[PDB]
């Protein structure tokens, strides 16, 4: 439930003490937990509502030059003067123009020439700022159990319901535990400061589209701008970048204007994210959040229930789910009330010895009418295994064949751990238990290497990284010194960033 | 007259036989001739009226996406189909999207997804073609002599007047000699094929501004386009470059459009020229024209005149003219009719021995009233020399001091010959006499080296040329082979192209 069609679901486990498994929650990737004797909830970061934004330097891109003039002098009368030189609503430039008897002068030489032009900008872009303290994360929980597949992405109504409940994570309150009343209460203390490296991420707004540009790229734009603390008729701080002065003679040179720089700043945004605007608050969908789940109050709901003793007809044809899990949905054709589904796996149905782990831990029926749908999730072993549901006579069976092997599972988990490391880096080691040598010391050495890497290379593209990886590959095969594996470390540390999408 | 305030005037001479001195006429640079006993005319290329242009691929830059749709299928039903896939007014893209029970499918896997979007372009650019055969050059002549400085750039009326007369050079008629009736007739056979390397120069029109792009740059643009043989609702041949498909799930992905590419194609035009549009004909101001002047019918007008025998009061304070020439303007306070001004130079006025050359050859007065202004042009020697005008008593004198030396004149003529060579190349040797070893053999070896250079490097900027000049400079000091002066030849052949503006 809610972690079923995401193609990026990670499974976490391993709480035999403490019950404080810690996770990072990206936007595209939901996370399913697994416990000893507690229900498996599915946590998923949905939005990130950046709220109450200020303004910084609002650039311009649509410049309209009008109301121009010119003035000159003979080659000894000094430079020219103009009334439209003495307001900063007009752009000006002085330029030496060759003059003589044909231009009514007295000598022959570099006569000066000033021209002016009123700068009228029509469509400007606005770069808002993002404080780190008014982020507003939105994590939606979803337990596994008594709910059919019609309530997987169904978000309409979760205050009345209990199986899914959402929580907000503000930096003024990372102490938010959701009340799954009957399941207990999932304690949840996130860490919204260390999000997507905020306070360097301006919120660029143009043409009613929105972005998350880096602060570096936003300050390094050569365009006309004014400070954001402004109102109508702004004062453009640097107009020389959008006007071009071709120098035609005879005491007036031509002031052409560069056109709409829309597409240029569009194709200059080769790495920024996209966001939407919900009015005053800019809701985006990206980033991550190193939370930490305290399962001190997750109890199984129907552990004091009997076993269902009726039909259990199948429905909705059970199917594999891209990691090997199997989402069986059954309907219970009886009236046993708040009862419990006797599901398991079996390599053979002569003995019925359960082998695969059941992801939907303690799967119950919460209804009491005739038909009551419910959705399981099972994880078969590699090979052939039957899906057994029902206690005795009128049990059901759907034979399964989970493809692959344990070596393939270990390789896929390795490559997705490398992908999660390539996306997050520092916060990749925050995915498990208390750590003594793999979640604290590893975070230390990876933090040191990530700082001394992202300050070393730090500014390379997708393609220049391939070029520098080929360069350190050639350096990593022709050297007779000890820095063969150091250049190969910078080979792997770059090309794994390239192997991901 | 008309070659007085151009700061690029070249002087040509040397007709002691043939009388067919040949010149190249750039737009910014006027050309003054000098003869044995013929009047010095001033020739100047004014416009270049490219007329009757066709159309080639007219690109688009303002794309407006509207009326979009989407369609999908379950992970085994093949790809999607749409009615808006079967017209080329809509852009489409198929993309695999992960689907499951939450999207109402039957399996879990790569379900396909097609989206469409109507391509509506608003502001398109049009690249016209330029045939080499409908160029229409416009050379304006101007003789030296009986005309004041009010008629230097005065172009209004030259059919009634004789001292200036214009000619057109079409490729259907490079046989155009102007009738300076009384001065004779300047024979003039130009060569309008070898202009600014035409038939590679498209005429890019956008936003009612105009350019002369290379054909290579115009065909190498990745933008939507259609062939120019068209009318309303065109068929855009390649729309994939201005739409971007971000893939959001749940059977509809978002079709964002890149904005106005105006500024991007503006800053991509880092080397094109600018032109104007005169309606149907595109008048530009650039390039050159290797003409050839036959002075077989240039006679002095007032060579059978007496000498003026009256006041010759100065007017308009005589001044130097950036090459050392001195443009004295006098008014004749008498009534001697069509008479002749007795002007000369003098290093001392005890002997009055003329030393400097008089540029305004045989300077006459054509009026007969009380006051009659006339403008001379004299070239003093290096040092101090007096300007003597008038025969006897009531002669006038303005002492002159021409600054510089003959070595400085030779160096300046060398650097402007190198600048003319750096601009033209092949046609730089077409600036003088018949040639046996300096205008034919030199054109041969320079033609060979210019072809084997402009096909060798041929595509480098202003800055990459500096980089490659530094590279061949370092190669030109550390080699023990014979290719030291060859790398230094490619040093000079590049850095002289960089020393010019």
């Amino acid at each position, epitope marked *: 439930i809610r972690c079923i069609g995401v193609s990026n679901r990670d499974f976490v486990e391993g709480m035999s003490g403490g019950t404080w498994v810690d996770v990072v929650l990206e936007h595209g990737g939901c996370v399913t937990v697994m416990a000893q004797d507690k229900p498996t909830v599915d946590i998923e970061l949905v939005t990130t509502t950046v709220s109450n934004m200020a303004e910084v330097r609002s650039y311009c891109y649509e410049a*309209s030059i009008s*109301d121009m003039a010119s003035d000159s002098r003979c080659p000894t009368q000094g430079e020219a003067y103009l009334d439209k030189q003495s307001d900063t*609503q007009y752009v000006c430039k002085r330029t030496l123009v060759d003059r003589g008897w044909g231009n009514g002068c007295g000598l022959f030489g570099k006569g000066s020439l000033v021209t002016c032009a009123k700068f009228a900008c029509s469509k400007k872009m606005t770069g808002k700022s993002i404080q780190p303290e008014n982020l507003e994360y939105r994590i939606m929980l979803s337990v596994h159990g008594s709910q059919h597949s019609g309530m997987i992405v169904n978000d309409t109504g979760h205050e009345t319901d209990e199986n899914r409940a959402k929580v907000e994570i503000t930096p003024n309150s990372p102490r938010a535990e959701a009340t799954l009343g009957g399941f207990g209460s999932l304690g949840l203390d996130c860490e919204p400061r260390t999000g997507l490296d905020f306070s360097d991420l301006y919120y660029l707004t143009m043409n009613n589209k929105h972005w998350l540009v880096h602060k570096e790229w936003f300050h390094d734009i050569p365009l006309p701008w004014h400070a954001g603390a402004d109102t109508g*008729t702004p004062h453009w701080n640097n107009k020389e970048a959008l006007v071009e002065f071709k120098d035609a003679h005879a005491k007036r040179q031509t002031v052409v204007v560069l056109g709409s720089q829309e597409g240029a700043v569009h194709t200059a945004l080769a790495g920024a994210l996209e966001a939407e605007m919900d009015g005053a608050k800019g809701r985006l969908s990206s980033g991550h959040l190193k939370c930490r789940l305290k399962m001190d109050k997750l109890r199984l709901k129907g552990v004091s229930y009997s076993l269902c003793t009726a039909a259990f007809t199948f429905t909705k044809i059970p199917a594999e789910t891209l990691h090997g899990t199997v989402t069986v949905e059954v309907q219970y054709a009886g009236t046993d009330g708040p009862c419990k589904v006797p599901a398991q796996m079996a390599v053979d149905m002569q003995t019925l010895t359960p082998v695969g782990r059941l992801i939907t831990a303690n799967p119950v029926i919460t209804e009491s009418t005739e038909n009551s749908k419910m959705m399981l999730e099972l994880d078969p072993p590699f090979g052939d295994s039957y899906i057994v549901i029902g206690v005795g006579e009128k049990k059901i069976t759907h034979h399964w064949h989970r493809s692959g092997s344990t070596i393939g599972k270990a390789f896929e988990a390795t490559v997705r751990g490398a992908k999660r490391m390539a996306v997050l880096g520092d916060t990749a080691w925050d995915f498990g238990s208390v750590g003594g040598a793999l979640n604290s010391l590893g975070k230390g050495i990876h933090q040191i290497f990530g700082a001394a890497f992202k300050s070393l290379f730090g500014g390379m593209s997708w393609f220049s990284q391939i070029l520098i990886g080929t360069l350190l590959m050639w350096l990593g095969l022709n050297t007779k010194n000890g820095s063969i594996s150091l250049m190969c470390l910078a080979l792997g540390g770059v090309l794994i960033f390239l192997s991901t999408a | 007259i008309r070659c007085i305030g151009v700061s690029n005037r070249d002087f040509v001479e040397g007709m002691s036989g043939g009388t067919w001195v040949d010149v190249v006429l750039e737009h910014g640079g006027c050309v003054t001739v000098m003869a044995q006993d013929k009047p010095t005319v001033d020739i100047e290329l004014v416009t270049t009226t490219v007329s009757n242009m066709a159309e080639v691929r007219s690109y688009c830059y303002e794309a407006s996406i509207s009326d979009m749709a989407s369609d999908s299928r379950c992970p085994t039903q093949g790809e999607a189909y749409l009615d808006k896939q079967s017209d080329t007014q809509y852009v489409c893209k198929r993309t695999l999207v992960d689907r499951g029970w939450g999207n109402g499918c039957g399996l879990f896997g790569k379900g396909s997804l097609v989206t469409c979007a109507k391509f509506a372009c608003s502001k398109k650019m049009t690249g016209k073609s330029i045939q080499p055969e409908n160029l229409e050059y416009r050379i304006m002549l101007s003789v030296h002599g009986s005309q004041h400085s009010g008629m230097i750039v005065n172009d209004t009326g030259h059919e009634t007047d004789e001292n200036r007369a214009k000619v057109e050079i079409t490729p259907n008629s490079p046989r155009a000699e102007a009738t300076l009736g009384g001065f004779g007739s300047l024979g003039l056979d130009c060569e309008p094929r070898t202009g600014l390397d035409f038939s590679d120069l498209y005429y890019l029109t956008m936003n*009612n501004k105009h350019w002369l792009v290379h054909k290579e740059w115009f065909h190498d643009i990745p933008l939507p386009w259609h062939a120019g043989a068209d009318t309303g609702t065109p068929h855009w041949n390649n729309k994939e470059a201005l739409v971007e498909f971000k893939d959001a799930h749940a059977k509809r992905q978002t079709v964002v459009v890149l904005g106005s590419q105006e500024g991007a194609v503006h800053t991509a035009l880092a080397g094109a020229l600018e032109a*104007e*549009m005169d*309606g149907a004909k595109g008048r530009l101001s650039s390039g050159h024209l290797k003409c050839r002047l036959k002075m077989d019918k240039l006679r002095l007008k007032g060579v059978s005149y007496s000498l003026c025998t009256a006041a010759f009061t100065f007017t308009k304070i005589p001044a130097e003219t950036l090459h050392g020439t001195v443009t004295v303007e006098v008014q004749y306070a008498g009534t001697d009719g069509p008479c002749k001004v007795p002007a000369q130079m003098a290093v001392d006025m005890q002997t009055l021995t003329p030393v400097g050359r008089l540029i305004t050859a045989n300077p006459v007065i054509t009026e007969s009233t009380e006051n009659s202004k006339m403008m001379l042009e004299l070239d003093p020697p290096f040092g101090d020399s007096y300007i003597v005008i008038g025969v006897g008593e009531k002669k006038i004198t303005h002492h002159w001091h021409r600054s510089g030396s003959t070595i400085g004149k030779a160096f300046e003529a060398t650097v402007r010959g190198a600048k003319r060579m750096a601009v033209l190349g092949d046609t730089a040797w077409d600036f003088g006499s018949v040639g046996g070893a300096l205008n034919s053999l030199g054109k041969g070896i320079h033609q060979i080296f210019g072809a084997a250079f402009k096909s060798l490097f041929g595509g480098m900027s202003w800055f990459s040329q500096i980089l490659i000049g530094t590279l061949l400079m370092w190669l030109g000091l550390n080699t023990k082979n014979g290719s030291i002066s060859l790398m230094c030849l490619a040093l000079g052949g590049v850095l002289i192209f960089l020393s010019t503006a």
Partner: antibody, heavy 121, light 107 residues
Framework: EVQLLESGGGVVQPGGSLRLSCTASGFTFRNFGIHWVRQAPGKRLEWVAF????????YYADSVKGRFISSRDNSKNMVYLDMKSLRPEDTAIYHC??????????????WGQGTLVTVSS | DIVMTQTPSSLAASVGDSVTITCRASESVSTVLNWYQHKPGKAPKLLIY???TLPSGVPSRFSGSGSGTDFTLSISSLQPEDFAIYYC?????????FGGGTKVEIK
């Protein structure tokens, strides 16, 4: 919309003075610009004056330079045109035309009705 | 200082015609030029700014185009509220100078 009102015009003896009051309403007056244009009868439309939003930058035409003093009131929402020492060539309808700043670039935007200013013998 | 000459100022058309008045420039004004709809005893409103585009409020029958040397105002269907004084006006070269005024008369 744009209630651009005009006042102050009447009959004027030559060499006299005149203060043209233009009161604006219907927008934010501080962040726009304001012009002064005239309609000489028998001839075309002309332009005589221009003020920036700051209240100190004042531009005029060649005929009225050194003759017109044009100011504005941000607080009481007024535009003033202290014309002094007029001539009988200045008989027109001095419209109070609002500039198109940052919205309709390079254009006289919405006009005022203009008062009748006649100077004769 | 520049002048804005145009089409002969007298035209008499019926209601619902397609009139195209051209404005001829003196020099290269380059698509910064305006038009006005003026009635006697009435303040003029802006009709076409920047030689191509329109503000809000006015109907889209008014279509202006052209630059360089000649400009044009085109109305698709002459409503009876359009019989007014039309003149073009540049804003490239300063001082800003208007056209001549073209009367649209009833037929």
């Amino acid at each position: 919309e744009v209630q651009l009102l005009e006042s102050g015009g009447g009959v004027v003896q030559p060499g006299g003075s005149l203060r043209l009051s233009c009161t604006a309403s219907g927008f934010t007056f501080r962040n726009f610009g304001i012009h002064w244009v005239r309609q000489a009868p028998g001839k075309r439309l002309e332009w005589v004056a221009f003020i920036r939003y700051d209240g100190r930058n004042k531009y005029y035409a060649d005929s009225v330079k050194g003759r017109f003093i044009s100011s504005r009131d941000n607080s009481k929402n007024m535009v003033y045109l202290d014309m002094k020492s007029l001539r009988p060539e200045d008989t027109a309808i001095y419209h109070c035309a609002a500039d198109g700043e940052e919205t309709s670039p390079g254009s006289f935007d919405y006009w005022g009705q203009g008062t009748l200013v006649t100077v004769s013998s | 200082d520049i002048v804005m000459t145009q089409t002969p100022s007298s035209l008499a058309a019926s209601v619902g015609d397609s009139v195209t008045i051209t404005c001829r420039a003196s020099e290269s004004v380059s698509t910064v030029l305006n038009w006005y709809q003026h009635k006697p005893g009435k303040a003029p409103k802006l009709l076409i700014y920047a030689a191509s585009t329109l503000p809000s409020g006015v109907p889209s029958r008014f279509s202006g185009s052209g630059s360089g040397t000649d400009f044009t105002l085109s109305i698709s269907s002459l409503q009876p509220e359009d019989f007014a004084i039309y003149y073009c006006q540049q804003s490239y070269f300063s001082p800003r100078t208007f056209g001549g005024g073209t009367k649209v008369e009833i037929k």
